[PDB]
Write an enzyme that holds these catalytic residues in place. Structure first.
Site, PDB file in Angstrom:
ATOM      1  N   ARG A  83       6.001 -15.440 -15.073  1.00 30.38           N
ATOM      2  CA  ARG A  83       5.891 -15.564 -16.362  1.00 30.38           C
ATOM      3  C   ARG A  83       6.294 -16.585 -17.398  1.00 30.38           C
ATOM      4  O   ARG A  83       8.054 -16.208 -17.490  1.00 30.38           O
ATOM      5  CB  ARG A  83       4.690 -14.597 -16.352  1.00 30.38           C
ATOM      6  CG  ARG A  83       3.256 -13.639 -15.994  1.00 30.38           C
ATOM      7  CD  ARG A  83       2.231 -14.239 -16.483  1.00 30.38           C
ATOM      8  NE  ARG A  83       2.439 -12.942 -17.386  1.00 30.38           N
ATOM      9  CZ  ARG A  83       1.102 -12.782 -17.776  1.00 30.38           C
ATOM     10  NH1 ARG A  83       0.199 -13.402 -17.523  1.00 30.38           N
ATOM     11  NH2 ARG A  83       1.562 -11.890 -18.858  1.00 30.38           N
ATOM     12  N   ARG A 125      -7.771 -21.384 -18.936  1.00 30.39           N
ATOM     13  CA  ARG A 125      -7.059 -20.559 -19.485  1.00 30.39           C
ATOM     14  C   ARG A 125      -5.787 -21.132 -21.236  1.00 30.39           C
ATOM     15  O   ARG A 125      -6.006 -20.131 -21.696  1.00 30.39           O
ATOM     16  CB  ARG A 125      -6.360 -19.160 -18.559  1.00 30.39           C
ATOM     17  CG  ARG A 125      -6.117 -17.922 -19.718  1.00 30.39           C
ATOM     18  CD  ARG A 125      -5.318 -17.204 -19.142  1.00 30.39           C
ATOM     19  NE  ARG A 125      -4.895 -16.897 -17.339  1.00 30.39           N
ATOM     20  CZ  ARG A 125      -4.298 -16.861 -16.421  1.00 30.39           C
ATOM     21  NH1 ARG A 125      -3.012 -16.969 -16.839  1.00 30.39           N
ATOM     22  NH2 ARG A 125      -4.671 -16.351 -15.188  1.00 30.39           N
ATOM     23  N   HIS A 150       0.713  -0.939  -0.114  1.00 28.21           N
ATOM     24  CA  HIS A 150       0.144  -0.107  -0.209  1.00 28.21           C
ATOM     25  C   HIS A 150       0.817   1.360   0.126  1.00 28.21           C
ATOM     26  O   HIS A 150       0.857   2.125  -0.932  1.00 28.21           O
ATOM     27  CB  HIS A 150      -0.442  -0.007   1.156  1.00 28.21           C
ATOM     28  CG  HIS A 150      -1.611   1.514   1.041  1.00 28.21           C
ATOM     29  ND1 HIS A 150      -1.102   2.252   1.555  1.00 28.21           N
ATOM     30  CD2 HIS A 150      -3.711   0.915   0.453  1.00 28.21           C
ATOM     31  CE1 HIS A 150      -2.836   3.328   1.298  1.00 28.21           C
ATOM     32  NE2 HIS A 150      -3.892   2.154   0.633  1.00 28.21           N
TER      33      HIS A 150
HETATM   34  N1  LIG Z   1      -1.918 -24.738 -17.544  1.00 26.48           N
HETATM   35  C1  LIG Z   1      -0.924 -24.301 -18.019  1.00 26.48           C
HETATM   36  N2  LIG Z   1      -0.211 -23.808 -19.314  1.00 26.48           N
HETATM   37  C2  LIG Z   1       0.994 -23.786 -19.689  1.00 26.48           C
HETATM   38  N3  LIG Z   1       1.486 -22.739 -18.968  1.00 26.48           N
HETATM   39  C3  LIG Z   1       1.218 -22.734 -17.171  1.00 26.48           C
HETATM   40  C4  LIG Z   1      -0.045 -22.910 -16.666  1.00 26.48           C
HETATM   41  N4  LIG Z   1      -0.156 -23.281 -15.760  1.00 26.48           N
HETATM   42  C5  LIG Z   1       0.217 -21.997 -15.273  1.00 26.48           C
HETATM   43  N5  LIG Z   1       1.202 -21.239 -16.087  1.00 26.48           N
HETATM   44  C6  LIG Z   1       2.893 -20.951 -16.966  1.00 26.48           C
HETATM   45  O1  LIG Z   1       3.104 -20.357 -15.063  1.00 26.48           O
HETATM   46  C7  LIG Z   1       3.274 -19.382 -15.091  1.00 26.48           C
HETATM   47  C8  LIG Z   1       2.535 -18.852 -14.129  1.00 26.48           C
HETATM   48  O2  LIG Z   1       1.751 -19.550 -13.679  1.00 26.48           O
HETATM   49  P1  LIG Z   1       1.139 -18.298 -12.348  1.00 26.48           P
HETATM   50  O3  LIG Z   1       1.168 -17.820 -11.114  1.00 26.48           O
HETATM   51  O4  LIG Z   1      -0.223 -18.407 -12.504  1.00 26.48           O
HETATM   52  O5  LIG Z   1       0.848 -16.980 -12.941  1.00 26.48           O
HETATM   53  P2  LIG Z   1      -0.455 -15.972 -14.675  1.00 26.48           P
HETATM   54  O6  LIG Z   1      -1.409 -17.372 -13.930  1.00 26.48           O
HETATM   55  O7  LIG Z   1      -0.263 -16.238 -15.674  1.00 26.48           O
HETATM   56  N6  LIG Z   1      -0.937 -15.082 -13.672  1.00 26.48           N
HETATM   57  P3  LIG Z   1      -2.024 -14.739 -12.605  1.00 26.48           P
HETATM   58  O8  LIG Z   1      -1.977 -16.531 -11.574  1.00 26.48           O
HETATM   59  O9  LIG Z   1      -3.126 -14.210 -11.822  1.00 26.48           O
HETATM   60  O10 LIG Z   1      -0.769 -13.632 -11.283  1.00 26.48           O
HETATM   61  C9  LIG Z   1       2.398 -18.480 -15.810  1.00 26.48           C
HETATM   62  O11 LIG Z   1       3.048 -17.551 -16.215  1.00 26.48           O
HETATM   63  C10 LIG Z   1       2.593 -19.819 -17.235  1.00 26.48           C
HETATM   64  O12 LIG Z   1       3.667 -18.886 -17.779  1.00 26.48           O
HETATM   65  N1  LIG Z   2     -10.559  13.138   3.139  1.00 20.02           N
HETATM   66  C1  LIG Z   2     -11.673  11.895   2.359  1.00 20.02           C
HETATM   67  N2  LIG Z   2     -12.661  12.593   2.321  1.00 20.02           N
HETATM   68  C2  LIG Z   2     -13.691  11.836   1.831  1.00 20.02           C
HETATM   69  N3  LIG Z   2     -14.054  10.768   2.234  1.00 20.02           N
HETATM   70  C3  LIG Z   2     -12.641  10.394   2.199  1.00 20.02           C
HETATM   71  C4  LIG Z   2     -12.075  11.167   3.179  1.00 20.02           C
HETATM   72  N4  LIG Z   2     -11.253   9.922   3.182  1.00 20.02           N
HETATM   73  C5  LIG Z   2     -11.407   8.839   3.050  1.00 20.02           C
HETATM   74  N5  LIG Z   2     -12.537   8.737   2.569  1.00 20.02           N
HETATM   75  C6  LIG Z   2     -13.590   7.874   2.874  1.00 20.02           C
HETATM   76  O1  LIG Z   2     -13.657   6.446   3.093  1.00 20.02           O
HETATM   77  C7  LIG Z   2     -12.766   5.399   2.541  1.00 20.02           C
HETATM   78  C8  LIG Z   2     -12.188   4.906   3.283  1.00 20.02           C
HETATM   79  O2  LIG Z   2     -10.594   5.478   3.461  1.00 20.02           O
HETATM   80  P1  LIG Z   2      -9.489   4.626   2.377  1.00 20.02           P
HETATM   81  O3  LIG Z   2      -8.315   3.973   4.080  1.00 20.02           O
HETATM   82  O4  LIG Z   2      -7.647   5.901   2.572  1.00 20.02           O
HETATM   83  O5  LIG Z   2      -8.967   4.672   1.825  1.00 20.02           O
HETATM   84  P2  LIG Z   2      -9.221   4.958   0.150  1.00 20.02           P
HETATM   85  O6  LIG Z   2      -8.572   6.232  -0.041  1.00 20.02           O
HETATM   86  O7  LIG Z   2     -10.711   4.731  -1.207  1.00 20.02           O
HETATM   87  N6  LIG Z   2      -7.695   4.176  -0.569  1.00 20.02           N
HETATM   88  P3  LIG Z   2      -6.435   3.363  -0.252  1.00 20.02           P
HETATM   89  O8  LIG Z   2      -6.436   4.407   0.340  1.00 20.02           O
HETATM   90  O9  LIG Z   2      -5.354   3.909  -1.564  1.00 20.02           O
HETATM   91  O10 LIG Z   2      -6.232   3.065   0.355  1.00 20.02           O
HETATM   92  C9  LIG Z   2     -12.640   6.053   1.339  1.00 20.02           C
HETATM   93  O11 LIG Z   2     -13.051   5.101  -0.049  1.00 20.02           O
HETATM   94  C10 LIG Z   2     -13.657   7.856   1.026  1.00 20.02           C
HETATM   95  O12 LIG Z   2     -14.600   6.483   0.882  1.00 20.02           O
HETATM   96 MG   LIG Z   3      -2.588 -18.079 -12.601  1.00 24.54          MG
END
Ligand SMILES: Nc1ncnc2c1ncn2[C@@H]1O[C@H](COP(=O)(O)OP(=O)(O)NP(=O)(O)O)[C@@H](O)[C@H]1O
Ligand SMILES: Nc1ncnc2c1ncn2[C@@H]1O[C@H](COP(=O)(O)OP(=O)(O)NP(=O)(O)O)[C@@H](O)[C@H]1O
Ligand SMILES: [Mg+2]
Ligand SMILES: [Mg+2]
Lengths: 245, 242
Positions: free
Chosen positions: A195, A153, A38
């Site tokens: 990847r 996928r 964050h």
């Molecule tokens: N069934 C599959 N067939 C082919 N390649 C695969 C398969 N599953 C995983 N991989 C490979 O392994 C890598 C790592 O897997 P993964 O952690 O799931 O990454 P990702 O699916 O591309 N994205 P994400 O899971 O959403 O973070 C992928 O980017 C592909 O290169």
């Molecule tokens: N200064 C502000 N004025 C109005 N609404 C606010 C304010 N600060 C926070 N909020 C509201 O409170 C929620 C929670 O606050 P917060 O934890 O900071 O989340 P965020 O700002 O949306 N995202 P992030 O801080 O990047 O994780 C927000 O999504 C807004 O709806």
């Molecule tokens: Mg995946």
């Protein structure tokens, strides 16, 4: 036995206490990582305003292009890290005794719906039974879901899931008929943000956390994961998890 | 004695490796994420270096370099505290309010300038002694003022107040407020109001959760109120040091 101690609290305590103390450690690790993720976003936004102001003053550059695309890589990685952190939170880490059929039936039924929509086929060669496991249900659901969603996928036409039970544990095998993974990449695919250059070209998935979430969950659940050649021609992912009695 | 260890009909050798792998799994994940974040950053930093070589120093390049340096330190933190989380977060040093929050406020003014909005510091922090984790307290203010920069319509105001007992930081915005009901809710993790979920489709909601946690851990309090500017008022109170 004390306030905020290790698993080495294991000296005396029951296995159960031992894992809850691990979860205590894990929940704070997850809090650390989500907190750093964050915070990394704010120097990044300011950095990105800097690149913008520089492009305004001195125009496009080979160097500026590099800084902008690297800043953009970081943004995506931080986003998927928070997407994970959001999900790993939202459910307290509590290990309970859970039966395999209850744990993974919803995952598999939903995978069949998704496959049906994609125009692909999902076949469950052998389904999970009431086999006793011990662990965090959400982590183990997510563990299977990531493996089958990856398969939906990268498969060309078909996906297959197969369960096997024994006195020692459960063996889950997921297969696809899509392209595989070269034997070299089979060890690295479990690393965070790894990847394959082939999947990087696709641009239809996250930054590469899926199998890192899988390896972590399964090791934490006293099991193992493996990537192999699939008889269907694609990738085979094998999860082994112990039985609880 | 009590329930001993059981994985399967396995050797002691298998029991120990299973146990090592189980407990070091999250540490390894966090150190692997740190290494993987570091490589695009190192590249980014070589880009800034190559640019300074070709076209020399600039106000803009200085900004990019110091922000890249902030990222480097936080990626290092993730790695350092991955291994030991022993008793959660346990480090604290003596710091003076002016040192702690001046950078936050100066950076908030840069961000406000870019947004086309105005930031006014009605009363700045002085050399007021605090005792805690500097990064948590920096982040605590930064989240509140960055919130104020986002949700404000045109203006933001920050005000410091000191006393024998503690420091009171008041942040105000002229943007929309928060209904009195949501004022307790806004501090929850991954929570956003339905009004902010329209303005921006979904998103993170950790900002004020990081705030509530850091200030409570530092023996203080946070409050959301109506702002005289028409938006939201966030008040941080923190105790002074002996
Ligand atoms: N069934 C599959 N067939 C082919 N390649 C695969 C398969 N599953 C995983 N991989 C490979 O392994 C890598 C790592 O897997 P993964 O952690 O799931 O990454 P990702 O699916 O591309 N994205 P994400 O899971 O959403 O973070 C992928 O980017 C592909 O290169
Ligand atoms: N200064 C502000 N004025 C109005 N609404 C606010 C304010 N600060 C926070 N909020 C509201 O409170 C929620 C929670 O606050 P917060 O934890 O900071 O989340 P965020 O700002 O949306 N995202 P992030 O801080 O990047 O994780 C927000 O999504 C807004 O709806
Ligand atoms: Mg995946
Ligand atoms: Mg915020």
């Amino acid at each position: 036995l004390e306030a905020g101690p290790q698993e080495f609290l294991a000296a005396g305590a029951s296995f159960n206490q031992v894992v809850t103390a691990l979860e205590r450690m894990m929940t704070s690790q997850q809090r650390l990582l989500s907190d750093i993720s964050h915070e990394l976003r704010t120097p990044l936004t300011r950095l990105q305003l800097g690149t913008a102001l520089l492009r305004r003053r001195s125009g496009e550059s080979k160097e500026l292009e590099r800084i902008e695309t690297e800043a953009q890589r970081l943004d995506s990685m931080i986003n998927d890290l928070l997407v994970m952190s959001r999900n790993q939170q939202k459910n307290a880490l509590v290990s309970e005794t859970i039966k395999a059929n209850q744990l993974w039936s919803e995952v598999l039924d939903n995978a069949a719906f998704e496959a049906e929509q994609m125009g692909k086929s999902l076949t469950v060669n052998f389904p999970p039974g009431p086999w006793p496991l011990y662990g965090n249900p959400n982590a183990l659901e997510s563990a299977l879901e990531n493996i089958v969603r990856n398969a939906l996928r990268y498969s060309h036409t078909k996906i297959e899931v197969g369960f096997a039970v024994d006195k020692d544990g459960i063996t889950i095998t997921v297969d696809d008929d899509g392209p595989g993974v070269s034997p070299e990449d089979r060890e690295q695919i479990f690393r965070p943000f790894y990847r394959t250059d082939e999947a990087r070209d696709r641009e239809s998935g996250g930054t590469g956390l899926g199998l890192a979430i899988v390896e972590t969950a399964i090791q934490q659940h006293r099991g193992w994961v493996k990537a192999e050649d699939s008889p269907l021609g694609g990738l085979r992912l094998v999860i082994w998890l112990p039985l609880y009695k």
